[PDB]
Design a protein around this ligand. Structure first.
Ligand SMILES: Nc1ncnc2c1ncn2[C@@H]1O[C@H](COP(=O)(O)OP(=O)(O)OP(=O)(O)O)[C@@H](O)[C@H]1O
Ligand SMILES: Nc1ncnc2c1ncn2[C@@H]1O[C@H](COP(=O)(O)OP(=O)(O)OP(=O)(O)O)[C@@H](O)[C@H]1O
Ligand SMILES: Nc1ncnc2c1ncn2[C@@H]1O[C@H](COP(=O)(O)OP(=O)(O)OP(=O)(O)O)[C@@H](O)[C@H]1O
Ligand SMILES: Nc1ncnc2c1ncn2[C@@H]1O[C@H](COP(=O)(O)OP(=O)(O)OP(=O)(O)O)[C@@H](O)[C@H]1O
Ligand SMILES: [Cl-]
Ligand SMILES: [Cl-]
Ligand SMILES: [Mg+2]
Ligand SMILES: [Mg+2]
Ligand SMILES: [Mg+2]
Ligand SMILES: [Mg+2]
Ligand SMILES: [Mn+2]
Ligand SMILES: [Mn+2]
Ligand SMILES: [Mn+2]
Ligand SMILES: [Mn+2]
Ligand code: NA
Ligand code: NA
Lengths: 437, 437
């Protein structure tokens, strides 16, 4: 409908609505009042402070700013003192080191203790950069606020907004850096069509160059890759989305896909036509945070995938899902059944001692020589990938993540067929198999 | 029963019987008469001449010896003149270049034209060494004649006597060299326990050393590996037989195994228990000599084996058989059925042009990105190894040997199950699967 018109139409999917902006204003002012009354020195940072926050993602970030001469725990203990005092309700969250998260007049707030540093060149971790992030952006982003929200909204609609591990996409800081660097959403999208996995965007130098990996240089700290948590595949997906958008722009790119919602019968028929084995490992979800859980699910699912490959079941793809009480590791394999008999490798013919040992063992079939080396027919203890994974998960739970593996130790189930389709996994299955509408 | 006693008992399985020795004497004398009457200059060479020939393998080798100054075809045309004159019946065989084979008083004879060379250092091919082979052995082998027959008999009972391609075992000349080098059958057997695939036996130097491959240096020509046609696997099998013999000597090692002669029902059950796909390619045997046929069958069977591996049917082993009118290429595979769906590799995400092409094609399922690269689900045109090989043999017969492939072009059949067990292949199947007694 013309790019420029679509972008105007997208601004309403993306700009927070009426009651939301004033909900923030009312929380912010009340928070100021409570802080001011305590004589606390602070700064509101992040996307609230710069009016760059996406529709529906209202959260206030406050950094408490304490004089340089308070020790490491003097900032930690005194910092947590104020968060409790100033929030209606609160939890003690753990990013890299302890901070406070809580609520004020219905609005999410994070309070973080950090040093009040005159100029950077003084950085222990992420926390101490953050005031400088805001400082750097404040007023380079003025005027371009809706460009940021357009980019956030594009990425969110497409499942790649956020650097948390469940997503491995783009952070807010990265989105604002990009807008500063290219000037607009549209220009970011046009130029990202030519990004590669070796693209280095150096914001402070106004430069793009090649490096070893995708790297967005923090203007506040040259060693920091702002895009560190962006996965290779989400970068790929973004580059492709940018190419598709420019070739045929649409409002559709700013609206989340309403999921496939398929009936078990249609999935049964798809699985039939593909001729694969589709199954899942079901187990209880351990009570750990997403940033801990999802890396473990990834590892568990990889280790099982690798086991399936090794055992010649020819896995096609895998996926995983956490509901509220259970986790599922989903697999599709090209081999439903393998022969009972296999070939075991023995020694070179020259090696008399080891040959004697190899031939000592009783077997149903006679070993043989092939290309200078002994081989034996021996018998598998499983012939389906489901039986293999029951064995593997029973015996090798210790490699499947600390908490995921411990859970699988207490209880797991392999589910196939119509029973699999009763579990809340049908969407993940459809995506794994590339099912169309 | 004591080695020394077993060896005495083996001498009767190995020394030609009464009517055979005199059958040879009568043929030899008659052959001399016919040659002498023509004024031909000749020498009886080979195992008849040295009384080293195995029981049942009576054949007379004559070399016609012509003065140095006759051109290449002067020896070829004049040489074939005498073979026709002197044999009762004859064929014109083709070794490296044309010679005569025929019969005299019931006995096989080969007549070969060669130069009468005073001292070697004058060699164009194999033919011109041969008089020198006999010369070298004549009287180094005197006294050790039965040692040779013991070794030939050992190898024959175990299917590895003869350098023709059907066998890829030990030639007669190689057996006599070995006996000269070690002094006896028993010592040959004791020392061969330590042969490796890098063992070089240098007969004329009285030396054993390491080289790049198993090499037995012709005492008559240092460049010639007398063991050139011995396969790696037959060398392995011989080394192992030598170790087994010395550990528990028996007359059994000089008697051919009477074959397994199994009933189809037992084979059906074995195949069931292994859980494999067992099948054969059947086609008409081309009318070519064994030394041409067997290398082609080997190549055909390898190419099909390699196709099966490539297509993920996980072949275990293969074998082949020629009867009088048909050939069979036998296969056993671990996968009886593979899924219809597979993964096709596409381009890296960066490569816009090629990605557009990859995604242009209509497919039932959506392509996806994994590890920086596009992939598509696509559909196999076959899901069993039998269907695969029907396709492969129909389309790629041109790589399956000149004559074997041409035959398969005119007609082939894939046979599985109870029908397979009707063909004269049950022995080869039993051996391929390592079936016991
Ligand atoms: N571990 C952490 N603890 C405290 N602050 C962090 C931490 N990690 C990053 N930060 C900084 O805090 C600031 C706000 O972070 P946040 O992820 O909330 O970004 P945002 O710009 O406010 O975007 P969003 O709209 O998604 O909330 C950023 O400058 C960021 O660098
Ligand atoms: N490279 C491979 N080749 C052949 N077998 C392998 C290979 N890697 C692993 N295995 C076999 O698979 C088993 C399990 O491997 P895996 O890494 O999934 O589990 P693990 O618990 O991490 O390993 P482990 O039990 O050896 O400590 C190993 O114990 C080994 O016998
Ligand atoms: N292509 C050939 N044409 C003619 N002579 C050959 C050819 N190849 C090898 N020879 C030689 O002819 C001689 C006899 O060969 P042959 O294979 O018959 O051996 P043998 O000692 O007589 O054993 P056997 O008892 O198995 O017949 C050997 O010295 C051998 O080197
Ligand atoms: N290395 C491999 N990796 C993937 N595909 C292969 C490979 N080798 C062969 N192929 C595929 O298998 C087909 C047949 O291979 P094969 O060598 O058995 O028959 P060919 O008649 O000798 O080959 P061609 O038809 O290519 O001349 C090839 O045409 C090719 O598409
Ligand atoms: Cl960052
Ligand atoms: Cl030779
Ligand atoms: Mg926040
Ligand atoms: Mg928060
Ligand atoms: Mg002969
Ligand atoms: Mg002959
Ligand atoms: Mn924020
Ligand atoms: Mn383990
Ligand atoms: Mn001979
Ligand atoms: Mn071909
Ligand atoms: Na197990
Ligand atoms: Na074909």
């Amino acid at each position: 409908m013309k790019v420029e018109e679509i972008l105007e139409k997208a601004l309403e999917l993306v700009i927070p609505d009426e009651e939301e902006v004033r909900k923030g204003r009312e929380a912010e002012e009340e928070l100021r009042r409570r802080l001011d009354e305590l004589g606390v020195e602070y700064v509101f940072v992040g996307s609230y402070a710069r009016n760059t926050w996406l529709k529906g993602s209202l959260e206030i970030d406050v950094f408490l700013l304490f004089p340089e001469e308070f020790s490491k725990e003097e900032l930690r203990e005194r910092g947590l003192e104020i968060g409790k005092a100033v929030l209606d309700s609160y939890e003690i969250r753990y990013a890299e080191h302890p901070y406070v998260h809580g609520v004020v007049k219905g609005v999410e707030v994070d309070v973080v203790p950090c040093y009040k540093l005159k100029e950077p060149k003084n950085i222990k971790s992420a926390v101490d950069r953050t005031p400088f992030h805001h400082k750097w952006l404040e007023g380079r982003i003025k005027g371009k606020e809706n460009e940021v929200r357009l980019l956030k909204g594009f990425l969110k609609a497409n499942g790649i907004y956020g650097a948390e591990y469940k997503v491995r996409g783009f952070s807010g800081y990265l989105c604002e850096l990009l807008i500063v660097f290219y000037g607009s959403f549209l220009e970011t999208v046009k130029n990202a069509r030519r990004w590669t996995r070796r693209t280095v965007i150096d914001v402070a130098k106004g430069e793009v160059r090649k490096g070893e990996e995708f790297f967005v240089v923090d203007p506040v700290d040259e060693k920091r890759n702002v895009a560190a948590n962006l996965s290779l595949d989400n970068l790929a997906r973004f580059v492709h989305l940018c190419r598709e958008f420019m070739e045929a722009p649409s409002l559709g790119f700013f609206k989340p896909k309403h999921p496939l919602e398929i009936e078990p019968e249609r999935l049964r028929k798809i699985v039939e036509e593909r001729g694969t084995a589709v199954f899942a490992v079901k187990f209880r979800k351990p009570d750990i945070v997403d940033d801990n859980l999802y890396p473990q699910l990834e590892r568990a699912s990889r280790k099982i995938f690798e086991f399936l490959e090794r055992e010649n079941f020819m896995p096609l793809r895998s996926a995983f899902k956490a509901s509220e009480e259970f986790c599922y590791l989903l697999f599709e394999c090209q081999i439903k059944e393998i022969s009972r008999v296999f070939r075991r490798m023995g020694p070179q013919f020259e090696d008399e001692r080891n040959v004697k040992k190899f031939l000592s063992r009783n077997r149903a079939f006679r070993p043989f020589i092939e290309n200078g080396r002994w081989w034996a027919f021996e018998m598998r203890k499983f012939t389906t990938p489901e039986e293999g994974v029951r064995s593997y998960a029973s015996t090798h739970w210790h490699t499947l993540g600390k908490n995921v593996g411990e859970s699988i130790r207490e209880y797991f189930e392999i589910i196939s067929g119509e029973k699999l389709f009763k579990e809340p996994v049908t969407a993940e299955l459809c995506e794994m198999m590339g099912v169309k509408d």
